[PDB]
Amino acid sequence: VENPSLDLEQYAASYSGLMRIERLQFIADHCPTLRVEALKMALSFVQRTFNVDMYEEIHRKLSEATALDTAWVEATRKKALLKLEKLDTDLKNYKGNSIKESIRRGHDDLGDHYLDCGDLSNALKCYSRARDYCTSAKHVINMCLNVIKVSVYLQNWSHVLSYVSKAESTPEIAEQRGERDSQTQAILTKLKCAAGLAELAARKYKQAAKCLLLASFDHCDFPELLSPSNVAIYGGLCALATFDRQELQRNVISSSSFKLFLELEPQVRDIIFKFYESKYASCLKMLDEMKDNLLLDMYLAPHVRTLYTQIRNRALIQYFSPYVSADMHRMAAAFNTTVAALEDELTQLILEGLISARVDSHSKILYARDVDQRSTTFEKSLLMGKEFQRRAKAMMLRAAVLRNQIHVK
Amino acid sequence: HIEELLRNIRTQVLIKLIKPYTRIHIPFISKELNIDVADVESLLVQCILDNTIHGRIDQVNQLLELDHQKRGGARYTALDKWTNQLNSLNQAVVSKLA
Amino acid sequence: GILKQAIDKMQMNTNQLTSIHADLCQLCLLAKCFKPALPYLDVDMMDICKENGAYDAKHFLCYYYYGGMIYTGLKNFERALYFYEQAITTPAMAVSHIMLESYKKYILVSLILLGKVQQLPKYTSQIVGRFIKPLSNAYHELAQVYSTNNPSELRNLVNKHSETFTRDNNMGLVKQCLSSLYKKNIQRLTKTFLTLSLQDMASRVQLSGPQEAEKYVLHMIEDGEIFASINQKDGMVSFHDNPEKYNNPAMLHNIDQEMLKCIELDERLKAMDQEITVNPQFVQKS
């Protein structure tokens, strides 16, 4: 497994915060023989943002790969302790002052500082206790996006979904007017992206794609939850796997607001367009080429295989939909697969009832068989009648035996 | 926009010509449509997938079987509905006790 | 014969179960002459004689179990399964001896005829769900392995657990389970392949040889479970899925025959309800 087309500089530039550190750790853990440059970048740039435990982790990783920096460790520790003491004294003073706005700002600041330190649970409980001092809906939305960020760091997606829904219901349902023909400060796009990401993480592809589809490019320039490139990749792949032809025509290829996302990544546009216009060889070839780079993403890593399997099954179903009797040599050639593996795939799919077809494996012809309504209805009616008669025969005997009150002794 | 054009006209011609027939040869369509057989198959598969032509394509003999079929068998499905109820009904009747 | 002369001289009606039926079935099973007991078993038995409080459960559970014995030896698996199921669902706040054997033979026969374990009816005593189920583990393991449609691990499993099966003296109904996989995999392949070469299907079902595949297909078509044709000019098994059109007078006659049984059942239920609506114990509870 080797891939030199990967660009770590773009990954570092696109994302920010703890997300870049987590992605670097993921790519180091999953991509061998490319660790030197990624860990060099991590050492060079992640030296900031109060690296304490992850610093030791990456030091151990470098030691395994192969002067000791220890004084800076206690220097940063004592600096963090004195900053914590200043924050504690400040928040006691503001609590004594009893000012809602100042207390809320101090709570947000200390939560951000604890997030920088690495105290995820402490920041979560700080925001939980700061929730009680909410005045306006905009502050609610801001602390809501902050809590969504910390929760997707914590990986509790059900809470994320409930929190997104309650955020949607907070400002009297989108201010009841649309915020004067859509909002310039469109946090709605960010919360919809968060909901789609959470649904994707919860193995709910249809809802995730539906929610992430409704995004606007000009309000997607806030790279603190997702980046436009991976948003486009997720949306395109999920829509390709899940939606049928009608939705693949009305939602993904004809939506003007989403052509920009397609233009961001031309490869996804080529994949979708070639899949739509009955062109499967190139589509599967490009998908197989993409898979290597796709597997390096940190969210979509545990979902690539099922996604690809669903795409392939849908492709087979769509290819056989308009045919009554197909020569499977051309079917195998167009799918970049030999005859034996195609036969195995067809015999596996037929047993599940997705494809109503039979295989004639002498001239290698895939025939389509239509069910006769009369014979099926007659057979099932007779079978049901026989079962009902047997059930009556049993239960009337049971009634007799209950009448005579027979039991073991 | 001449590629979007030159395409609706041929689809309209195909729809108009396909109405009376029920099974034809692909080369016969190729002759009047003035395009190769592969493009004829591409147009036919696109039209079928778009639910504009009610038919199926035969590739081993390059035929186009229409749908001059499906007599009034709705009765049958409704009959099946009885089964899907009545079975369950007796399942509730026997499950009362004895 | 003596017993078959007593049955008609004590029961009020031919459809009237009595304790002497159990003795007749026991003697028939132990005499290895199954045919003479068929007329007294095919007919259904409604109402059971109390015979002055001497008809305990030991004369009702035994009869429906020896009926399963006598039918499972004549390859009439449907009625044997029905009798075993009826024997299972007796109301009993304890564990009996013949109940375990009836459950084991039920779990064997259900695998024999269907491809899965038929779910027991809900009107069953809770004793079977707590005591008898964990006691018979080998048969449940047989069912679990059979559910995978793998004819290789089943041989090892039946070889390993041979001691308990031989102790239960039900040998013969488990080798039938082993042979049932080769009869069910072909039927499963029927739903997918219109025609096959003997080599490919022989490798798929794993009987180790194309020659024996022809023998199995011939046996299947002879016994009528499948509609197949052997074409030896090119090594072919063709699957003709056109059994019936449902338009001949024979189907009408079958429908009429089913109607004349449903009508009799309805008449019997109506008569029983009319009899119930006259009891002096009733009329006062409402």
Swiss-Prot record, chain A:
Keywords, in A-Z order: Cytoplasm, Nucleus, Phosphoprotein, Signalosome
Keyword field contains Membrane: no
Stretches of the chain forming a coiled coil according to its record: none
Location of the protein in the cell: Cytoplasm; Nucleus
Tissues where the protein occurs: Widely expressed.
One Pfam family per UniProt: RPN7
Gene Ontology MF terms: GTPase inhibitor activity
Residues annotated as domain PCI: 211-373
GO biological process: JNK cascade; protein deneddylation; protein neddylation; regulation of protein neddylation
Record Gene3D superfamilies: 1.25.40.570
GO CC, alphabetical: COP9 signalosome; cytoplasm; cytosol; nucleoplasm; nucleus
Family affiliation: Belongs to the CSN1 family.
Oligomer status and interactors: Component of the CSN complex, composed of COPS1/GPS1, COPS2, COPS3, COPS4, COPS5, COPS6, COPS7 (COPS7A or COPS7B), COPS8 and COPS9 isoform 1. In the complex, it probably interacts directly with COPS2, COPS3, COPS4 and COPS5. Interacts directly with inositol kinase ITPK1. Interacts with CAPN8. Interacts with USP48. Interacts with ASB4; this interaction negatively regulates GPS1.
Function: Essential component of the COP9 signalosome complex (CSN), a complex involved in various cellular and developmental processes. The CSN complex is an essential regulator of the ubiquitin (Ubl) conjugation pathway by mediating the deneddylation of the cullin subunits of SCF-type E3 ligase complexes, leading to decrease the Ubl ligase activity of SCF-type complexes such as SCF, CSA or DDB2. The complex is also involved in phosphorylation of p53/TP53, c-jun/JUN, IkappaBalpha/NFKBIA, ITPK1 and IRF8/ICSBP, possibly via its association with CK2 and PKD kinases.
Domain comment quoted from the record: The PCI domain is necessary and sufficient for the interactions with other CSN subunits of the complex. Mediates the interaction with CAPN8. The N-terminal part (1-216), which is not required for deneddylating activity and CSN complex formation, is nevertheless essential for other aspects of CSN complex function, such as repression of c-fos/FOS expression.
Protein name per its UniProtKB record: COP9 signalosome complex subunit 1
Species annotation: Homo sapiens (Human)
Swiss-Prot record, chain B:
Disulphide linkage map: none
Location(s) in or outside the cell: Cytoplasm; Nucleus
Modifications the protein undergoes after translation, according to the UniProt entry: Phosphorylated by CK2 and PKD kinases.
Function text: Essential component of the COP9 signalosome complex (CSN), a complex involved in various cellular and developmental processes. The CSN complex is an essential regulator of the ubiquitin (Ubl) conjugation pathway by mediating the deneddylation of the cullin subunits of SCF-type E3 ligase complexes, leading to decrease the Ubl ligase activity of SCF-type complexes such as SCF, CSA or DDB2. The complex is also involved in phosphorylation of p53/TP53, c-jun/JUN, IkappaBalpha/NFKBIA, ITPK1 and IRF8/ICSBP, possibly via its association with CK2 and PKD kinases.
Record family assignment: Belongs to the CSN2 family.
Subunit structure comment from the entry: Component of the CSN complex, composed of COPS1/GPS1, COPS2, COPS3, COPS4, COPS5, COPS6, COPS7 (COPS7A or COPS7B), COPS8 and COPS9 isoform 1. In the complex, it probably interacts directly with COPS1, COPS4, COPS5, COPS6 and COPS7 (COPS7A or COPS7B). Specifically interacts with the ligand binding domain of the thyroid receptor (TR). Does not require the presence of thyroid hormone for its interaction. Interacts with CUL1 and CUL2. Interacts with IRF8/ICSBP1 and with nuclear receptors NR2F1 and NR0B1. Interacts with NIF3L1.
Protein name as it appears in the record: COP9 signalosome complex subunit 2
Taxonomic path: Eukaryota, Metazoa, Chordata, Craniata, Vertebrata
Gene this protein is translated from: COPS2
Stretch of the intact protein here: 346 to 443 of 443
UniProtKB/Swiss-Prot annotation, chain C:
A GO CC annotation given for this chain: COP9 signalosome
TM regions (residue ranges): none
Tissue-wise expression: Widely expressed. Expressed at high level in heart and skeletal muscle.
Keyword Cell membrane: no
Keywords annotated in UniProt: Acetylation, Cytoplasm, Nucleus, Phosphoprotein, Signalosome
Superkingdom, taxonomy of origin: Eukaryota
Localization per Swiss-Prot or TrEMBL: Cytoplasm; Nucleus
List of residues that carry Phosphoserine: S286
Main location: cytoplasm
PCI domain location: 76-244
One BP annotation, GO: response to light stimulus
Assembly and oligomerization: Component of the CSN complex, composed of COPS1/GPS1, COPS2, COPS3, COPS4, COPS5, COPS6, COPS7 (COPS7A or COPS7B), COPS8 and COPS9 isoform 1. In the complex, it probably interacts directly with COPS1, COPS4, COPS8 and COPS9 isoform 1. Interacts with CK2 and PKD. Interacts with the translation initiation factor EIF3S6 and IKBKG. Interacts with ERCC6.
Free-text function comment from the UniProt entry: Component of the COP9 signalosome complex (CSN), a complex involved in various cellular and developmental processes. The CSN complex is an essential regulator of the ubiquitin (Ubl) conjugation pathway by mediating the deneddylation of the cullin subunits of SCF-type E3 ligase complexes, leading to decrease the Ubl ligase activity of SCF-type complexes such as SCF, CSA or DDB2. The complex is also involved in phosphorylation of p53/TP53, c-jun/JUN, IkappaBalpha/NFKBIA, ITPK1 and IRF8/ICSBP, possibly via its association with CK2 and PKD kinases.
UniProt record similarity statement: Belongs to the CSN3 family.
Note: Amplified and overexpressed in some osteosarcomas (OS), suggesting that it may participate in TP53 degradation in OS.
Stated name of the protein: COP9 signalosome complex subunit 3
Native species: Homo sapiens
Annotated gene: COPS3
Span covered, complete protein: 122 to 407 of 423
